[PDB]
């Protein structure tokens, strides 16, 4: 659910509304194939969500 951009983050920040982070790159539901979820960027929710 959460994400961390910079290094010295004490607690992992939660994803803001209208965004979603899947558990893994291949265990997502609606992700354009040309991207992956390293864990530092919370992707935007696809059209019709």
């Amino acid at each position: 659910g959460y994400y961390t951009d910079v290094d010295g983050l004490p607690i992992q920040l939660p994803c803001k509304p209208g965004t979603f982070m899947p558990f893994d790159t291949a265990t997502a539901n609606l992700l354009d194939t040309g991207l992956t979820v390293d864990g530092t960027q919370c992707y935007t929710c696809q059209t019709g969500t």
């Binding site: 992700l31 991207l35 960027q41 992707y43 935007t44 929710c45 696809q46």
Partner: protein, 48 residues
């Protein structure tokens, strides 16, 4: 009568020892790494 023969000289006194020296100060610390590296541009879009 001739006087009694004088006695020989007595031994010299013992000498004192020498103390040890204090430790020298620690070496000067080096300054930190040479500046930051050049900034990155940033790439692409990052939009799903």
């Amino acid at each position: 009568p001739p006087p009694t023969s004088p006695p020989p000289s007595p031994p010299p006194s013992p000498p004192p020892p020498r103390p040890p020296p204090p430790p020298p100060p620690p070496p000067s610390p080096p300054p930190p790494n040479r500046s930051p590296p050049p900034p990155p541009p940033a790439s692409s879009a990052i939009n799903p």
